[PDB]
């Protein structure tokens, strides 16, 4: 900088140090692989993420559980109020007259305005649970929208009702809570660090923020296998699995993710093993032609329905059956990412 | 009664449309028919700012008209000297997902926000040498799409939660909320006098909001797709919008009607950003066709192109004196044109 002054040269020296720092940050950044977890109804419940966290070894201190107390009580009320509206929908009268008044009291309860379980409500909810009609409507979960864990909570109303009540780890796990915004989970395996970007709680036009993740390694999906019979009340008789299939097709058809792998996780493997015995998949999906009492055949049919949606026929759709007690979900994500990278390399070296 | 209400709303909409129709003596293109065309506009990259390693989403020029800030998805906010291409500062962001950027009119402060739903204010003129976060403003439930300093202590932010908020930076609390809009609000623009602003939303409506009262004075609905960009005319009595539909639309504030549309049969992509020239004669729009266009705003005929970039032009900003035009892009380079 012969024409430069003494201070101009010092400014150029600062811009060179800044460039060095930017390059070092970029080197550090590319060693991280971005995985985009898409938010479905199974992901909206957000219990699987908690349980998978327990597997990594992260736990809850007492402070965290005091965090979830209020959410536990809020869940009892939410489930109960939904069950009442389901009764009104299904035209099932209560076996006991006193239950009608208890139902009304339950209806007027405001869900967010509740921080402490109240003594009149503890008895109202208990007596409502004791109603045989209520047990019958609980038997018919699949026709309406209900928490998966209503039975466990309503069975143990006494311990929750105690003024001194600390939620157990199990109570913490099953508090279905919606999420405010992008939550990122960093995990490191075999010298490779990944970031799982959960976008489930965004709740805003996806057309206006989807291109942010245009360049990612994989778009992970999570769908439940026990969803074939469930029809939600808010939809007018729409199957939830057909809703998850439409979402899967819509996402994978996105031009932003044309270079991104698709990983699919099928969840609630145990719940299907019990559900298949009393519920026939053929009734909800006419194509199914199998033993009609086999969970293995139903799983393969469901996975076939999902994989058939691929609009390329050249791109792999990795798959796994996860039981909520799986300890191989991280290894599968690594092996699917390693094979994504292998195929990308083969494409760039003109071998494939 | 919901029936009487919806009928009343339809009747009021009918009255509004009749009022606008009555006050339309002539088109803007009829009045400016006998005016001399701008002519071909030829502009060249006088500088190229390299250093961002990801897509650049937002840029904001400084009032001095030499310093500019830019935001990128690699988690970096970079203040640059335009004249010498020198990097004055590089700020690491906590959330890499940033969609908007602003520079304080004094020059002491920058603001950034994104998919984390927080607007962060950093101080540049602090006395330990480093640039540190002054305050984190967290009240919105949707992503922050735009933020524009009103003073050193007042900032107005737009959010994908359908609401715009006016904050007090010192206290940390939003003093005013504008809630009329139904779709996500994508862009915000402040009037020269900083007493009114306009916001454009995903519902194809743009609304003029009074900053002191907190209500909506006017609403305009000429577009048929999401409005992604909005900018005031220098006078302050007009503004322009850019939409996913290829057209840019100019709307008056006193006549309360759309004045012109800037469209070309070939142009079918979205408009990422829009801005004016200092005289208000040129309207510069950035497109997803990888190139920026320059329209004579009074005859609505295209006059120039800016074809340097090879990806989507994400941000376009002109200087306060009109010396140059910076354009950022998803290819991670800024270019200054003159």
């Amino acid at each position: 900088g012969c024409t430069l002054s003494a201070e101009d040269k010092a400014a150029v020296e600062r811009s060179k140090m800044i460039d060095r720092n930017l390059r070092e940050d970029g080197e550090k950044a590319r060693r991280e692989l971005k995985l985009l977890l898409l938010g479905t109804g199974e992901s909206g419940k957000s219990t699987f993420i908690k349980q998978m966290r327990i597997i990594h070894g992260s736990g809850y201190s007492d402070e965290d559980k005091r965090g979830f107390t209020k959410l536990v009580y809020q869940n009892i009320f939410t489930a109960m109020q939904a069950m009442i509206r389901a009764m009104d929908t299904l035209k099932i009268p209560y076996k006991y007259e006193h239950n009608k008044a208890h139902a009304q009291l339950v209806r007027e309860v405001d869900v967010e305005k509740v921080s402490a379980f109240e003594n009149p409500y503890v008895d109202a909810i208990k007596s409502l649970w004791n109603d045989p009609g209520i047990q019958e409507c609980y038997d018919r979960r699949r026709e309406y929208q209900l928490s998966d864990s209503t039975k466990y909570y309503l069975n143990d109303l006494d311990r929750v009702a105690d003024p001194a009540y600390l939620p157990t780890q199990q109570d913490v796990l099953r508090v279905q809570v919606p999420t405010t915004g992008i939550i990122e989970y960093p995990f490191d395996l075999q010298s490779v660090i990944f970031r799982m970007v959960d976008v489930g709680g965004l709740r805003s036009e996806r057309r206006k923020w989807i291109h942010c993740f245009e360049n990612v390694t994989s778009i992970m999906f999570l769908v439940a296998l026990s969803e074939y019979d469930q029809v939600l009340v808010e939809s007018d008789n729409e199957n939830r699995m057909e809703e998850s299939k439409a979402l899967f097709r819509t996402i994978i058809t996105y031009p932003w993710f044309q270079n991104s792998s698709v990983i699919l996780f099928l969840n609630k493997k145990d719940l299907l093993e019990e559900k298949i015995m009393y519920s026939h998949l053929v009734d909800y999906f006419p194509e199914y032609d199998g033993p009609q009492r086999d969970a293995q055949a139903a799983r393969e049919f469901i996975l076939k329905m999902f994989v058939d949606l691929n609009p390329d026929s050249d791109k792999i759709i990795y798959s796994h059956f996860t039981c909520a007690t799986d300890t191989e979900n991280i290894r599968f994500v690594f092996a699917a990412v390693k094979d994504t990278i292998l195929q990308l390399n083969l494409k760039e070296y003109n071998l494939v | 009664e919901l029936d009487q209400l919806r009928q009343e709303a339809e009747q009021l909409k009918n009255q509004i449309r009749d009022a606008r129709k009555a006050c339309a003596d002539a088109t803007l293109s009829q009045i400016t028919n006998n005016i001399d065309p701008v002519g071909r506009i030829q502009m060249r990259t006088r500088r190229t700012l390299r250093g961002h390693l990801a897509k650049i989403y937002a840029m904001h020029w400084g009032t001095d008209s030499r310093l500019l800030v830019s935001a990128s998805q690699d988690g970096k906010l970079i203040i640059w000297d335009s004249y010498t291409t020198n990097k004055v500062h590089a700020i690491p962001l906590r959330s890499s997902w940033v969609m908007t950027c602003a520079y304080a009119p004094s020059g002491n402060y920058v603001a950034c926000g994104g998919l984390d739903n927080i607007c962060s204010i950093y101080n540049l003129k602090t006395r330990e040498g480093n640039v540190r976060v002054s305050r984190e403003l967290a009240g919105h439930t949707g992503y922050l799409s735009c933020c524009r300093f009103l003073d050193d202590n007042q900032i107005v932010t737009s959010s994908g939660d359908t609401t715009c908020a006016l904050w007090d930076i010192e206290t940390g609390q939003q003093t005013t909320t504008f809630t009329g809009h139904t779709g996500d609000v994508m862009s915000l623009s402040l009037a020269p006098d900083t007493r009114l602003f306009v916001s454009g939303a995903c519902d194809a409506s743009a609304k003029l909001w009074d900053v002191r009262e907190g209500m909506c004075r006017q609403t305009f609905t000429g577009h048929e797709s999401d409005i992604n960009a909005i900018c005031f005319f220098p006078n302050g009595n007009a503004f322009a919008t850019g939409s996913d539909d290829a057209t840019c639309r100019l709307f008056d504030l006193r006549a309360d009607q759309e004045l012109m549309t800037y469209s070309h049969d070939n142009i079918i992509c979205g408009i990422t950003s829009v801005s004016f020239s200092k005289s208000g004669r040129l309207l510069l729009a950035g497109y997803d066709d990888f190139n920026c266009n320059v329209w004579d705003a009074l005859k609505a005929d295209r006059a120039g192109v800016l074809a340097g970039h090879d990806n989507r032009v994400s941000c376009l900003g002109v200087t306060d004196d009109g010396m140059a035009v910076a354009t950022g892009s998803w290819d991670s380079f800024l270019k200054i044109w003159n």
Partner: single-chain antibody
Amino acid sequence: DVQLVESGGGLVQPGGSRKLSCSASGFAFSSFGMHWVRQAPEKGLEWVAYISSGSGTIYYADTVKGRFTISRDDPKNTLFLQMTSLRSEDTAMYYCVRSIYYYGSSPFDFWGQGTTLTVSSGGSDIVMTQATSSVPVTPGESVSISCRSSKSLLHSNGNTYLYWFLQRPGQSPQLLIYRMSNLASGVPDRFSGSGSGTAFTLTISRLEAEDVGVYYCMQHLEYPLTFGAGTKLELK
């Protein structure tokens, strides 16, 4: 807040060697370039050395070039100045001075307390001259100090690299004005500066007792950094 506290001075036998060190606190030391400046026992003050941010650049004064060495431990936040072959012109007070250079910054803004060093017994550059050494003025009257330069301090980029400092009796120097017009942060708006290419003037309106002291002009257009003789303001 920002504190630079140097250590290492004392009584040194002639021909020996001494190492000085300024410890920094309360600021991003690694991003600041450093200077050592020194003041004779009764004379003005002269620039000694300059180490850059990141240690990429080092400049020494003609007089000490080759017998002095400057180094910075950026992680430990310290600045060292090795001195060898101590001559009797090395009796002085050594002041650590931080400075940062980007568009719009203020160099030489913070000076250290200084260490005393005692040892028992202007070619091809710019010389900056102040033709006055004693101006006693009563409080309340405008005072104009003048300073002249060998060549034009106005660079082609549009900046005139003249800095004005002040030295209160028993106190370290402190920056008043940088680049001929700008005021440093925390100085009263009473002080103003206005100069042509070679001639410069600092005006103190509404003089107050705190302003009394020795005023030094300085140039930064080229190294070596040359100060002035200093103009002293006293009470009547």
